[PDB]
């Protein structure tokens, strides 16, 4: 599960890339004051990630995953409730399957032995070619 919906993440609490999940993995760039006038900026801050989004049918990404400045895997996603199109909240298509991406093994080390296979998914008239990693734990 995702702890909470996606909000604004100031750049320096993040270490490494911020991957958000439209079905196809995507890396999100930062934004300065000119790009977020309504964010209550602090004089410490210069750049932030705007991760707010509804589900990609109408929004941008189902969810996002990055790593804390302290080295901790943090995730965000849409509120929980065509399998993953209504209830997706991150890279997890099902409770057993996540979307593969170059940083999956660091963010999610427990998925080392998952089997991977290529799938396709239509979202909003756009086809997404994905690799999925799957299977159980005892």
């Amino acid at each position, epitope marked *: 599960y995702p702890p909470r919906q996606c909000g604004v993440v100031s750049a320096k609490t993040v270490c490494g890339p911020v991957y958000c999940f439209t079905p*196809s993995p995507v890396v999100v760039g930062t934004t300065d004051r000119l790009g977020a006038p309504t964010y209550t900026w602090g004089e410490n801050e210069t750049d932030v990630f705007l991760l707010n989004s509804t589900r990609p049918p109408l929004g941008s990404w189902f969810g996002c995953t990055w790593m804390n400045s302290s080295g901790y895997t943090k995730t965000c996603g849409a509120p929980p409730c065509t399998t993953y199109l209504k209830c997706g909240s991150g890279p997890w298509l099902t409770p057993r399957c996540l979307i593969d991406y170059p940083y999956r093994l660091w963010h999610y080390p427990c998925t080392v032995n998952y089997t*991977i*296979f*290529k*799938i*396709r998914m*239509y979202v909003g008239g756009v*086809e*997404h*070619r*994905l*690799t999925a990693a799957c299977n159980f734990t005892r």
Partner: antibody
Framework: EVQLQQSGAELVKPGASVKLSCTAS????????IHWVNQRPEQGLEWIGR????????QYDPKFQGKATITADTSSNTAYLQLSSLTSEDTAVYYC???????????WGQGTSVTVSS | DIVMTQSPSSLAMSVGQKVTMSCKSS????????????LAWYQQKPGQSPKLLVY???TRESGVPDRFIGSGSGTDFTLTISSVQAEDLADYFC?????????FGGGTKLEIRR
């Protein structure tokens, strides 16, 4: 569908080799299998082989084993089909195609015409 | 190799007529764990490259009109055009995507009467 763009038509001498390319646009070629199919003039379709570019893993029709080599560069999002010791029989259109796990060819390039003549 | 045989070689239909074309594989294409028959139908319009019409014997590819219906199982499969349209002018190929080498049928030619 997804976008595959193949290289231009070629003329090859008998006994020489040809290398055709197939570039992906709008998706990462690592997330698909790339198959190569040929079609001779006014004839049917014939599967040549396929590559998984995520690890370079190839399968072929064994009658093309040796004569055909399929490669893939994910740096440039491009697959390649090389054919050696070409004969006049090899004159044909060569398509590249994508598939997922099912291996059904869901998207096809426009084809590259290859003519073998002296 | 799995031999795929199509019938008839050519058809001549007017706009709105219903038509059926047949494909038969030398070997069953069923995966019992899937209950799926790994058979696909491709359409090639004049001067064009093939496009996937149907896969898994009956699953219509997204965007393909409702009038195209794949059916069959075991070794016998059919493609039906419930109301032939002018744009359906094409060669139609069946193909098993079950085991390598993946093999195609000889195709069925669909011409239009007017």
């Amino acid at each position: 569908e997804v976008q595959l763009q193949q290289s231009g038509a070629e003329l090859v001498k008998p006994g020489a080799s040809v290398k055709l390319s197939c570039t992906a646009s709008g998706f990462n070629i690592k997330d698909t299998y790339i198959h190569w199919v040929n079609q001779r003039p006014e004839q049917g379709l014939e599967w040549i082989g396929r590559i998984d570019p995520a690890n370079g893993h190839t399968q072929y029709d064994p009658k093309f084993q040796g004569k055909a080599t399929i490669t893939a560069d994910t740096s440039s999002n491009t697959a390649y089909l090389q054919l050696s010791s070409l004969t006049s029989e090899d004159t044909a259109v060569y398509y590249c195609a994508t598939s997922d796990y099912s291996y059904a060819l869901d998207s096809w390039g426009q084809g590259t015409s290859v003519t073998v003549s002296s | 190799d799995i031999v795929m045989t199509q019938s008839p070689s050519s058809l001549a239909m007017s706009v709105g007529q219903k038509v059926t074309m047949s494909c038969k594989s030398s070997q069953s294409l069923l995966n019992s764990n899937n209950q799926k028959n790994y058979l696909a139908w491709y359409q090639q319009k004049p001067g064009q490259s093939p496009k996937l019409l149907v896969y898994f014997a009956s699953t219509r590819e997204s965007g393909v009109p409702d009038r195209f219906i794949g059916s069959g199982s075991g070794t016998d499969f059919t493609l039906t055009i419930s109301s032939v349209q002018a744009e359906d002018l094409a060669d139609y190929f069946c193909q098993q995507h079950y085991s390598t080498p993946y093999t195609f049928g000889g195709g069925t030619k669909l011409e239009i009467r007017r």
